[PDB]
Amino acid sequence: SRILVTGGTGQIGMELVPYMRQLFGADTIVNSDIKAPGRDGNFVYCDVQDRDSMARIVTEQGVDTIVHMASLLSAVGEANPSLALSVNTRGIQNVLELAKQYQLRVFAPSTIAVFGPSTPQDETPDTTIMRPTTMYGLTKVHVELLGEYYYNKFGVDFRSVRYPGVISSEALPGGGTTDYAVEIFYEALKHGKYTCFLNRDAKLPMMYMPDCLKATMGLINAPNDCLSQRTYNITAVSFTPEEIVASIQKVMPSFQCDYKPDFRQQIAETWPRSIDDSIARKDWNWQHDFDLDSMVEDMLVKLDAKL
Amino acid sequence: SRILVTGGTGQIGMELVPYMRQLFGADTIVNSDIKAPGRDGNFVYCDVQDRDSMARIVTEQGVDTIVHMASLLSAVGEANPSLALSVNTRGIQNVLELAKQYQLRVFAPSTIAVFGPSTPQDETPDTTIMRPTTMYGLTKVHVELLGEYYYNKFGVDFRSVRYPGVISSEALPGGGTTDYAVEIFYEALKHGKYTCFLNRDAKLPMMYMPDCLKATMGLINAPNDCLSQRTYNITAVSFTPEEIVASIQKVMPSFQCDYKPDFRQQIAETWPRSIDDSIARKDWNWQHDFDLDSMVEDMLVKLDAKL
Amino acid sequence: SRILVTGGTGQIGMELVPYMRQLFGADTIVNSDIKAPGDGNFVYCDVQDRDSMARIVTEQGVDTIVHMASLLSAVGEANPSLALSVNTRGIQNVLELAKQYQLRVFAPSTIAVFGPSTPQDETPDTTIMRPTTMYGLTKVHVELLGEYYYNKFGVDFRSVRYPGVISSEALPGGGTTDYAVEIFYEALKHGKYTCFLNRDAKLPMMYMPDCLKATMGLINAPNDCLSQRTYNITAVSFTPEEIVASIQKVMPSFQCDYKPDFRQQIAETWPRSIDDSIARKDWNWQHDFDLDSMVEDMLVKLDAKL
Amino acid sequence: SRILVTGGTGQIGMELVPYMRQLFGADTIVNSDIKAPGDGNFVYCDVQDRDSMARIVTEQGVDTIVHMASLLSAVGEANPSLALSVNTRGIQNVLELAKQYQLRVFAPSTIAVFGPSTPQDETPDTTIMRPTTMYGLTKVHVELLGEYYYNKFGVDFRSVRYPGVISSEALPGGGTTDYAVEIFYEALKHGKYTCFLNRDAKLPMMYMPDCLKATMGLINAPNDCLSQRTYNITAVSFTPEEIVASIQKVMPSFQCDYKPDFRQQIAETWPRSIDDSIARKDWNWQHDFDLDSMVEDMLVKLDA
Amino acid sequence: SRILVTGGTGQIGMELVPYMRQLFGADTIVNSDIKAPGDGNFVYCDVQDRDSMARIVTEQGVDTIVHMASLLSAVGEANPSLALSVNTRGIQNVLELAKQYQLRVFAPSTIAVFGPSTPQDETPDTTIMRPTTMYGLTKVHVELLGEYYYNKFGVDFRSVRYPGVISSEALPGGGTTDYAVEIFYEALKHGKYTCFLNRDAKLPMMYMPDCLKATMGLINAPNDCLSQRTYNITAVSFTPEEIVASIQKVMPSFQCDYKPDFRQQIAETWPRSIDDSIARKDWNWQHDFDLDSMVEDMLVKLDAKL
Amino acid sequence: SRILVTGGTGQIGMELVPYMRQLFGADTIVNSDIKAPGDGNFVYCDVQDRDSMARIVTEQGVDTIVHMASLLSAVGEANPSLALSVNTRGIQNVLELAKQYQLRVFAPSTIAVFGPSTPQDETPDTTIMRPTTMYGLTKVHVELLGEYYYNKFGVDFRSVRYPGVISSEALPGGGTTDYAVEIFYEALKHGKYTCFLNRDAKLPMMYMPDCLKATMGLINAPNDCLSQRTYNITAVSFTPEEIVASIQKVMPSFQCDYKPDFRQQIAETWPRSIDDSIARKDWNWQHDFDLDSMVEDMLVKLDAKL
């Protein structure tokens, strides 16, 4: 009867946890991280590298599901090799080893970063070539393959979704590659102008936070019998910075945008431009709600409020 | 100056080691493992999960290259999945971290078990879908992705070869899926009959040991500038039990074979039937010298002696 | 029987080890570090790992640890927790085995133990010590803890506080007193140098042969000689402009520029000169190299290398 | 204070000079020769030119000449009248100056002062001396003249009879005991050597750092302990087959041939072993290196 | 064809040269010296001037050098630097010319090759030689070099070790054994003498006739009979009281005093008696004059002069 | 620019060299001799070796030779042939190089140029010179030849005839006027002296600072004020009894005995006094020390130095 979120305090978790609490009762969701929320009132410290500390939480709290968000992301992965390797692989391995022991089910999300330059670049399918260029990406492939294997070998109900770039009104950008899609709106509101660090024309899959929540929950609640697979690509839209610029000027016409590429372009070029998520459409009725324009308008009202 | 072989006591190691000592001199190959050679005379204990001990060997022995052979194979991988996961992922991480701190180069094997049932099974490409079902297999995707990532991130000269089934007269047969092809011969010679544990018709890629040693030394001495990839498929032939049996029976006609297929069959059929190794033919002039009938005559002659 | 040197592959080790081999024999020094030399008796030894040191002390018949291993002012500031761990756990392990095994110990200290509030001209042995850099503070711990093993358990423990050490052998690498080695490469390679200290930032300094002599002087002195365990050692003091001017005696066409950086804020917290009276009196410490001589020799040796 | 070395650029010199520098200060030692070193204070001094030595002594504050200059036994046999002039006029010049300027003198002698009528087993300090080489007969002249200057004029004269000296720094070139340096080079370059002495030609020998230690031991000894002026000094004795056997304890595969030449007829008139007990009692002479360890240490030092 | 005598105007030369002219013809001996006789074929030869010597040898058809020139023990100790040059350069030039022109050489050695460490009774031919005098160390170089030239270049080299030599004809030159010439002049002039040697300093000695005979005996011997190149030769051995006593057998009035000086400490380092049995064997050496008869003869002959 | 002194390490040299360094620069004086100072610019030079001088001249940029090197009257009488080679050959080689290199020379003479023929009271510059000692006669040859090089070749040659020279720095050394240095050592050490000249042997004498002032006065004089090239110079004349009486004005208990040796027959052939009226006219020669003042000053100076 209880769900343990790890990495609960990050971008996704900071909204995922309140939404699961909405759906299931405040008290049924155990939120955990290595940093406290920015209230909450049912929070625990958990470093996912420390397997015993996690056994402790699982047992004391009556946990039957781990929503494992804890990760180091693309930037810190590039910045610091072995720590990312260590948090991300040791996290999934501890999490999965615990699920088999106590019979937990687990969700852990993947990422479009699992894809490389030799991965087909348009309408990228669910089973395809995976040769990532980033530490973050390669640790994510292991997640997948290790979670599938725990499924197949021990029947650990293991599930996952490859997130596209996620746009949120609530977490401050963390210097990642898709994060030009969050910074932009701040700068739009503060200065009426942005300098973007991707080529004008770097197309990427992106999705607005509520759809990310909807997808996360949709697969977590899907009855197990409908799942042709364990990990699903999911998308909402693909856009280029030039489109989101133009989308913003529909509401705020005076807004401008410079372009000054840095190393992040080189990363973006190795990732999908668009993802084929048909398989989630069919199996578990996956359906996004927000297009480019509505996400742009909603983001704009929210952050213009957040001041 | 010196070469460090890890897992130097394995099947491949018990022969790679002497060979490397013929090419560069006895004193120039540091032979290490957690089991003594079954003299050697330049043997050190080295548990690849212990980074510092390795730091100690590398420093003391004047090592510039690591030929990382250490691994748990597919049998023990399934029987004891936690173990394999820590020796394989942690032995390769420590090797790369050291290769980086000490500017080493590294050779580490991959395997055909990197591939899965959604991988195109005839003429398997170097760059393809990889969704292996075995613990052993998925630890080897990680070996591949992290070696490649060290190459591109830190200039660690990392190189690898996907061994197919390997046959030899000197290492004792284990519980491997491709191992039937080592047993068959002992059973030919001792009884005049064998019962194989795969179906009559499960095609696999295989290679006789001197080609294995060949390919290993060709990839390792190739000049860096001719290598378009870091990891390469290598093959020699491909055959079914049915056909290695007929081959044996042309040398010993009274040999019979019988077929009782265990779980190793459900491992076998998720593997390639043939691998496309053109890229290694192209880049570093990979050429095998043993077809089936010549490895059979040779196996047969050599075990006849060894008894 | 044997001496173990830790950190034996740094700037001082790579010249201190072969010198002690001369004086004692080659089989009599166990060289150890975490990187090989750029040996005969070389062993890998991470001085944060006490067991391994126990092993080396035991299998080698060690009776003296000349404990060079340390992170320096640069990595100290850039990775502070790492510095604090190698330098503190290193001195604690070495001291804790000196006691268990009846071992003698030499550990260098440094002028960086001194602070803004230390009198900075003819700085005495016993004085205010409030360093500003992680490196400095770890070395006050060095001093305090070796002193206390001495008075508490009779571990024969000795150090010397090195000033900036100058040498041909070892490459420069981001330290504050390093300007005094880079200067020479730049003069030989290019006729000129951009110095990162103010022209007038007086520091105490010594040329390796005197660093070596002082090390062996305190190490070989009879124990009944030493009114203290730590000693200030100096040779000369000078400014960047003075050594510039010294170079120009031999290479008239040499020029110097000053773009000062973070290292100036380090340099002005340290002494301008050091009172080493007490080493001169206790164990007849006497330096041989002044600035012109060291300059001359630096240029001759480097020119050979390059 | 200041010490003049003559012949400082040869085999013994090039390692004695830096050792004296470490003991006394770089600046205290005037290194001189007729070749430059292959420094700081090097000067050209041909020891047959007396008054060039007068110049050097006077300008440099010399109080002691360490007179290493000589032609050796090969050049001695190959060109006798030059060896005669260098060896004999050189000691006479040094001792004459020593007397004008109140200098001390160190001038080595040699096991070659002995010949076929000398008892050749633990040969004593005071014994029959009828040597067959030009080089040895010049060195009895050295001893007799040094001792005479000591008795007659108070010139503090001292000497040590070297056995064969083995070292890593100078490279061989023709002596009779050079066999024990060649062998090492050939051991390492080829895995084999041809010895030009009989398998069993036993001779007293000494590794360099001992040689250096015996040289400074006599030099520093206080004058009142010295019962004589010249001292036999030895470390060990061995035959080429023993040094071969020694090397094989490190390099099992090393092999050795015997093609004896004229140096055999030289080695044969030399001692097998020398009695240095007098140097052991008057000034505490003690060798540190036996066969097996000089062989160990030569092999490492040459390999590097 | 001809014989060159060096040093031919010395005590030995002035009687060796007429003896040789009787055996071989007046004209067959080239007498030479740096002083003239008290002759005919006399030439000036300074034996430290090699080419004057080559001159004489080639012009005069010389095939044998009888090399007498030397400074004795007296001028050896007084002017020790010149003794060194005449004695070492003379035998060197004479050996170098003997090799170039294929000459035989005779060159006298002396009992002063022996020192205090030499066994002093029946002193053998091969034995310890640590002479204390310049004169004796130069003569060891004489022997050693002459032997070397023999074994090396086939120079026919021969010496005898003269014991003290007694003769009438030559004026005693304050050498050490030459008390035994003085004694006689004083005996006849004064009936009394003062000996500068202790009363019991035993020395080997020989009367001039036996000197000549030995010189000639060694010179004419066939080379195939010589087991060695230098030979001990004696006739008798005696003390001053022993010679004093012999004299007083003819001149019973004769009295003697003893006032010892430095020459005593010379005499103390020499043999008391020499063993010359190798020569008596090899080449039939045999003296004719014992003490009493050399005493009777000196007295007659010296009565003759004066 | 530079001055070479020969024999620089002698009685006068030992003080002439530092005085010249004071007046000219440490660096402008090249000290030289065949023995070291008992400095910082000292070279060996034997003045009988012309080219070693040529080397020094050329290498040191010398323009003036101050030629002090000489054997003096006792080595002269003891070793006459050597005296002759040093004094006549050193002047010769000095003057021959002055000519080739256009050098100036100062070379001193001596009152020993005069003999028993010389009128001995108020002896003129130009007078009879029949000296009886080797030293003397070599010095007449220095003069005559120095003058010749002056007249024939324009070599600026100058000399002074020193009378006995007295100083506190250089130990006496068995010369004739040396009694007047000896005397003071004996006064202070034993309170008493035995003089080797007659009590009444009157001789010219000059205290060292006057000796340095006459030397530099001639050397510095302008060339045109000089009517001669060689000058008598003097200060006082006394007998040994005069200096005895003078010594007693400070040291009343002092006593002097008289035992003449060979040195009296030297003294007796020297002038009693000299006429230096010419050096006084031409170059303003004026001495400063009379008997009494040199005696007080010698006594104090020596007393401090024992």
Ligand SMILES: NC(=O)c1ccc[n+]([C@@H]2O[C@H](COP(=O)([O-])OP(=O)(O)OC[C@H]3O[C@@H](n4cnc5c(N)ncnc54)[C@H](O)[C@@H]3O)[C@@H](O)[C@H]2O)c1
């Ligand atoms: N935001 C996106 O665009 C995106 C895209 C693909 C996948 N995802 C995945 O969603 C998950 C959460 O995403 P996010 O954007 O909120 O990441 P984030 O970096 O914002 O938050 C991750 C959280 O994990 C925590 N953490 C770090 N190390 C830890 C450890 N050792 N133990 C426990 N917690 C630790 C951090 O404190 C942080 O709160 C991650 O697995 C991530 O890969 C996000």
Ligand SMILES: NC(=O)c1ccc[n+]([C@@H]2O[C@H](COP(=O)([O-])OP(=O)(O)OC[C@H]3O[C@@H](n4cnc5c(N)ncnc54)[C@H](O)[C@@H]3O)[C@@H](O)[C@H]2O)c1
């Ligand atoms: N034989 C084949 O058909 C084949 C095929 C593909 C790849 N390979 C690869 O070749 C390499 C060696 O192959 P092998 O067949 O000789 O395997 P193997 O099982 O015969 O030998 C592996 C060796 O590793 C040692 N080992 C196990 N754990 C260790 C640890 N923690 N530290 C150090 N050593 C450890 C074992 O003692 C053994 O000696 C492996 O990476 C394997 O995946 C082999």
Ligand SMILES: NC(=O)c1ccc[n+]([C@@H]2O[C@H](COP(=O)([O-])OP(=O)(O)OC[C@H]3O[C@@H](n4cnc5c(N)ncnc54)[C@H](O)[C@@H]3O)[C@@H](O)[C@H]2O)c1
């Ligand atoms: N260079 C100077 O001017 C100077 C001045 C004062 C004091 N010192 C002191 O002298 C000693 C040696 O100085 P240096 O200048 O040669 O320093 P360095 O930085 O050149 O070398 C120090 C050595 O420590 C080794 N090391 C680092 N961590 C280690 C660990 N855990 N275990 C073992 N070895 C480790 C490094 O590899 C290196 O060889 C240090 O104690 C230093 O603080 C140097």
Ligand SMILES: NC(=O)c1ccc[n+]([C@@H]2O[C@H](COP(=O)([O-])OP(=O)(O)OC[C@H]3O[C@@H](n4cnc5c(N)ncnc54)[C@H](O)[C@@H]3O)[C@@H](O)[C@H]2O)c1
């Ligand atoms: N090496 C041995 O085994 C050994 C043994 C016994 C004695 N010694 C003695 O030790 C002394 C030095 O030994 P070494 O083996 O180095 O001899 P060496 O031949 O190596 O060196 C002698 C040096 O003297 C120099 N020299 C030659 N002629 C000279 C001259 N006219 N003036 C100045 N220098 C001149 C040569 O250039 C040479 O460097 C010698 O006296 C030798 O007799 C050596």
